[PDB]
């Protein structure tokens, strides 16, 4: 149960925490400027802005630039969340987390220039294909398991796992984007946030909660990859919440019994029985039957052959992304909210 493999991981995470803390306590600020970048096309949106494909004019490399509107962030009381986002993201470093390359701000906006992950959202492909075979889901699930092992070891909760936030890179692996609700926390926290289908019961019930919410959200993810629909759905949020707290799941008849067993233990309503939140931690997931053919180190090093490589014609190609309406990026001549985002 405990061998030298488990000690190899403990040594790596201990070193990764050292790296993370240096960057956590001394974050990078103001590493570029708006007009170092040609703005091409919107790859997606959110409540306070959008991500755009961009070309760094002096290196010619492509990036994805998040743009947040300071005034809107303030209007909606989401300052501390957008501060965590940048702070967490410039500090982490794992093969399945989107690299934050540059960040800066001007009078109206916050900017996070990330690596461009050209394969599109896992969401897009999952809806198109309908569902993923178990081997295909496990390939992706394994990468979330390792990524959570990293993040939780650093005291981070992610809190918004969904296919919409997993992007596929040129070699067919996941990069996690969207750290908008990621938080460093020792102990419990209480904010009602996340995506309705993926919210753990303890979140819905105002009970206060921990890392374990991310392991519930993985059960949902694995289920939705495998079934093609999430285990609790309904037209409006409230009905999804009712289904989630009842703790009744039905499985499609094609799910293997191993998968059913894994999922009944991730979708445990009881915090004390949930895989991930027991004494062996993540090792109860990794040592489960469903993952018995998973070479965890092979997954970390990216030498497993991916079941699906997205077609990319060249750098700057946006065919794996939906189209959105473009807005011009206005920059006011007076400073919006300087005190509030001064650490950004």
């Amino acid at each position: 149960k405990k061998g030298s493999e488990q000690e190899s991981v403990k040594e790596f995470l201990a070193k990764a925490k050292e790296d993370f803390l240096k960057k956590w306590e001394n974050p990078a600020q103001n590493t570029a400027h708006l007009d170092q970048f040609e703005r091409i096309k919107t790859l997606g949106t959110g409540s306070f802005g959008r991500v755009m494909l961009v070309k760094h004019m002096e290196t010619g490399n492509h990036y994805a630039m998040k743009i947040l509107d300071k005034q809107k962030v303030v209007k909606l009381k989401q300052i501390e969340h957008t501060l965590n986002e940048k702070r967490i993201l410039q500090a982490v470093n794992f093969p399945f987390l989107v690299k934050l390359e540059f960040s800066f701000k001007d009078n109206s906006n916050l900017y996070m220039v990330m690596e461009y992950v050209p394969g599109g959202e896992m969401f897009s492909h999952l809806r198109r294909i309908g569902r993923f075979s178990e081997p295909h889901a496990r390939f992706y699930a394994a990468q979330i398991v390792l990524t959570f092992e990293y993040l939780h070891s650093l005291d981070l909760i992610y809190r918004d796992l969904k296919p919409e936030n997993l992007l596929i890179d040129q070699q067919g692996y996941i990069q996690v984007t969207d750290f908008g609700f990621a938080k460093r926390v020792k102990g419990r926290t209480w904010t009602l946030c996340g995506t309705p289908e993926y919210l753990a019961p303890e979140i819905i019930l105002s009970k206060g909660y921990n890392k374990a919410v991310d392991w519930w959200a993985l059960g949902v993810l694995i289920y939705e990859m495998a079934a093609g629909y999430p285990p609790f759905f309904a037209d409006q949020p409230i009905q999804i919440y009712e289904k989630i707290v009842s703790g009744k799941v039905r499985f499609p008849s094609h799910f293997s019994s191993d998968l059913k067993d894994l999922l009944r233990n991730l979708l445990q309503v009881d915090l004390t029985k949930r895989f991930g939140n027991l004494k062996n931690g993540v090792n109860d997931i990794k040592n489960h039957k469903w993952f018995a053919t998973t070479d965890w180190i092979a997954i970390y090093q990216r030498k497993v052959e991916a079941p699906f490589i997205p077609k990319f014609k060249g750098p700057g190609d946006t065919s794996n992304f939906d189209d959105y309406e473009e807005e011009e990026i206005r920059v006011s001549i007076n400073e919006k909210c300087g005190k509030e985002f001064s650490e950004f």
């Binding site: 959110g46 409540s47 909606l76 009381k77 989401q78 969340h81 969401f123 809806r127 309908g130 918004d160 969904k162 919409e164 908008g180 609700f181 904010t191 009602l192 946030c193 996340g194 995506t195 309705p196 289908e197 079934a227 093609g228 629909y229 999430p230 759905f233 309904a234 037209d235 409006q236 949020p237 039905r250 499609p252």
Partner: peptide, 19 residues
Amino acid sequence: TTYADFIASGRTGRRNAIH
């Protein structure tokens, strides 16, 4: 079927988070 019911639901699109 449950797939059909999901496909006819209002929640097959990109799902926003709440706060």
